Amino acid sequence: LQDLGVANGEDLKETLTNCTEPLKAIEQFQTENGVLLPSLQSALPFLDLHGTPRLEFHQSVFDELRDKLLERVSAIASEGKAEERYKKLEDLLEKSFSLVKMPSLQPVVMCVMKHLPKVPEKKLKLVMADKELYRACAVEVKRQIWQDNQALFGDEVSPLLKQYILEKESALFSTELSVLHNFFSPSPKTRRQGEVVQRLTRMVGKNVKLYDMVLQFLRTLFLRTRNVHYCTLRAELLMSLHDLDVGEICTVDPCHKFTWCLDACIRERFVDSKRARELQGFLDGVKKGQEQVLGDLSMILCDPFAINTLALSTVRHLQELVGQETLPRDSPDLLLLLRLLALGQGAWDMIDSQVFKEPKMEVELITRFLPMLMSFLVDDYTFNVDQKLPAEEKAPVSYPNTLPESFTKFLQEQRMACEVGLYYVLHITKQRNKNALLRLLPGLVETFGDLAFGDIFLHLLTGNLALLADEFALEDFCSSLFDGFFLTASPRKENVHRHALRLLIHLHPRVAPSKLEALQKALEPTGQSGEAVKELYSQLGEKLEQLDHR
């Protein structure tokens, strides 16, 4: 009250303390702190006679008049000539910030700061410093501190990004297998509905500096973690800015159109000719001098759902080349798919060091890998047809389960060949071509960069493995993937051991008794994984006791 020349409670007690006439002093204080209209000084005794104190009609008019004051704050933001209206709001700010400490004039001032593009930053500094103001402050106040200094932005995006990785890790490690659904079913717009990235969009609003801030912080963590989660969150933040139709980012960002195209690509999980032509022309707009966004552009492509999209697209192109009677050299869209996937996988390397070039594809990879895959499918369908014909021959034509060693060499040395082979295995697992499944599974003992042990592919292979549930009773079907493949890199990374343990946790009732017993004692925590394997092994032991009752 003293900030604008009015008394407080301590001054009241001074006015009472050491006074020969305290009652008249109290009446004088009441007169000095009343509502100053001439009709009230007579009506106050009269309304007091009713059993209604003066404070009660004060409370009613208090609610009414602050409602109108907030209404007029919004009005002067939207009403009056510009210099006069901003002068009025800034003057009212100077009047009102003395009572932001009081419980009345906080949100009024927060609206006033919401409607001014810039402020003297002392009050923004107090807003961040005080937790109550840090909560109740309007969105654009927080934007102004972030736009003036990055400290609070980092301080608040760090827990939100920690929570995003918590969600990613928890969802990727979850132990449900079904023909009904998997965890990759939601589209990127389905995943944007979570409040993390939407609130990040609110924190950024329509500001480009905060966009650069989130870009750099995701860049830093993507450079330290080697994990596609921050890439996905940039894509989600950009398309959530587009969900609000944020023109400040969408029209200026050269990446916005291309990510919008990729959104439809991921929604259908394929790059069809329309959006393929769109993305290909977008790539062909890359020319020397203005390639600076190639890092961000490929960094968008890293999303797990985008890897799913591109890899299943390549498998589909491989499979449709079979029926077309065409060599893989005559597949422009397939080359586009591989170009985009190679760019995206090389995105992180571009973040460490900007290397602008359209990569060239490996010779044996077009001329020797894909024709072998087409030959595998041709043999599969020849065997199927020979089965379906009436009386082909005794013991009809055995489908080659053989491994031409070039296929395994490309599964283990040529990254893009590795990933497309992984998703080839996944797709035949959906179609349950068992002979093809055990044709292409062996040779995965050696892999480039353990991409065959990544969380994405391992999750999806676990998701497909409930289709052939009874085969886990047979030791070989599980051993080909567990004793042959997982244990080659189970003790190397936590995700592999966790993936195997969740797969056995879900499908414990159907695995054979000694088989699951040996699997637990072999997939016991080996010493390269923390509380995750501890809780999964506790569940493994409890369900192994349950299996001992089976």
Binding stretches for other proteins (CB under 8 A): 179-180, 272-274, 319-320, 323, 381, 384, 431
Q: Tokens 């906080």, residue?
A: 106
Nearest one of 550, 525, 547 to 536, comparing CA atoms: 525
Nearest one of 211, 245, 215 to 230, comparing CA atoms: 215
Pick the closer one to other proteins by CB: 319 or 539: 319
d(CA 79, CA 81): 7
Cα 436-438-443 angle, rounded to 5 deg: 110
d(CA 485, CA 470): 20
Question: CB atoms < 10 A from the CB of 256, how many?
Answer: 19
The CB-of-255 to other proteins minimum distance in angstroms stands at 21
Question: CB atoms < 10 A from the CB of 106, how many?
Answer: 21
d(CA 390, CA 380): 18
Give the end-to-end CA distance of the chain in Å, rounded to a whole number: 77
Q: Which two tokens stand for residue 381?
A: 């369908």
Nearest one of 28, 32, 37, 80 to 61, comparing CA atoms: 37
Nearest one of 268, 264, 270 to 316, comparing CA atoms: 270
Q: Which two tokens stand for residue 363?
A: 């010779």
CB contact at 8 A, 480 and 443: no
CB contact at 8 A, 462 and 176: no
CB contact at 8 A, 237 and 189: no
Instruction: Report H helices in 369-454.
Output: 370-388, 405-413, 415-430, 434-440
Pick the closer one to other proteins by CB: 15 or 431: 431
What's the one-letter identity of residue 295? G
For helices 455-464 and 494-506, what crossing angle results, to 10°?
10
Q: Which two tokens stand for residue 29?
A: 């204080």
What are the φ and ψ backbone dihedral angles of 100, each rounded to 5 degrees? -65, -30
| Sequence-ordered list of residues with C-beta below 8 angstroms from that of 474, at least 6 positions apart, any chain | 512
Please give the helix or strand (H or E) that residue 336 lies within, else none: helix 332-345
CB contact at 8 A, 427 and 315: yes
CB contact at 8 A, 385 and 379: no
d(CA 369, CA 417): 8
Nearest one of 233, 229, 226, 312 to 266, comparing CA atoms: 312
Pick the closer one to other proteins by CB: 192 or 508: 192
The CB-of-384 to other proteins minimum distance in angstroms stands at 8
The CB-of-242 to other proteins minimum distance in angstroms stands at 14
Pick the closer one to other proteins by CB: 102 or 389: 389
d(CA 464, CA 185): 14
SS3 172: helix
d(CA 119, CA 90): 9
The CB-of-492 to other proteins minimum distance in angstroms stands at 35
Pick the closer one to other proteins by CB: 227 or 431: 431
Residue 443 Rama label (left phi>0; alpha psi -120 to 50; beta): left
